[PDB]
Design an enzyme around this catalytic site. Structure first.
Site, PDB file in Angstrom:
ATOM      1  CD  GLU A  11      28.964   6.064  -4.110  1.00 36.58           C
ATOM      2  OE1 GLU A  11      29.311   7.095  -4.052  1.00 36.58           O
ATOM      3  OE2 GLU A  11      29.554   4.842  -4.169  1.00 36.58           O
ATOM      4  CG  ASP A  20      35.786  10.185  -2.152  1.00 38.80           C
ATOM      5  OD1 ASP A  20      36.564  10.685  -1.411  1.00 38.80           O
ATOM      6  OD2 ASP A  20      36.025   9.058  -2.902  1.00 38.80           O
TER       7      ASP A  20
END
Ligand code: CL
Ligand code: CL
Length: 162
Positions: A11, A20
């Site tokens: 991540e 994202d």
């Protein structure tokens, strides 16, 4: 290696709000803020999560605190789900981590309708599970990470993470 380093690798870490892979406002270590397209709504969500007027930037400690909470929450979502739990309890530690990653990334809902995969993992048919898990949007949209996760499930080792 463990779940935290693992997700820290998948991540990354960013201290300013960003979008994202799906285009949703996020911050820190993959901490989703909101699905809405409004920046201010995200900023509102952030402040609320941090407990202060942040203006869209947070500190490393703060990121780390959200992260902790998020891992925790994922495990707990797993344990509270009737479909997941049994699977989870059946697995070894390394593979548990693989399962957490997935839940962290896509939610309980998310991993809970992979029924066939679930079945196969429960049975410890790893190569088979591995092929089934690859037939998914997940894999097609985030292939390098899905590969890492799937080889984890497949091998029970951390080799995909070094
Ligand atoms: Cl929160
Ligand atoms: Cl990817």
């Amino acid at each position: 290696m463990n779940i935290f380093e693992m997700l820290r690798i998948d991540e990354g870490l960013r201290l300013k709000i960003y979008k994202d892979t799906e285009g949703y406002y996020t911050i820190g270590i993959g901490h989703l803020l909101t699905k809405s397209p409004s920046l201010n709504a995200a900023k509102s969500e952030l402040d609320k999560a941090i407990g202060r007027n942040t203006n869209g930037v947070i500190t490393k400690d703060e990121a780390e605190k959200l992260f902790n909470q998020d891992v925790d929450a994922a495990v707990r979502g797993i344990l509270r789900n009737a479909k997941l739990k049994p699977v989870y309890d059946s697995l070894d530690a390394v593979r548990r981590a693989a399962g957490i990653n997935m839940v962290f990334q896509m939610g309980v809902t998310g991993v809970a309708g992979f029924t066939n995969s679930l079945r196969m993992l429960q049975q410890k048919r790893w190569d088979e599970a591995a092929v089934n898990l690859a037939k998914s949007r997940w894999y097609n949209q985030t292939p390098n990470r899905a590969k890492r996760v799937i080889t984890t499930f497949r091998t029970g080792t951390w080799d995909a993470y070094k």
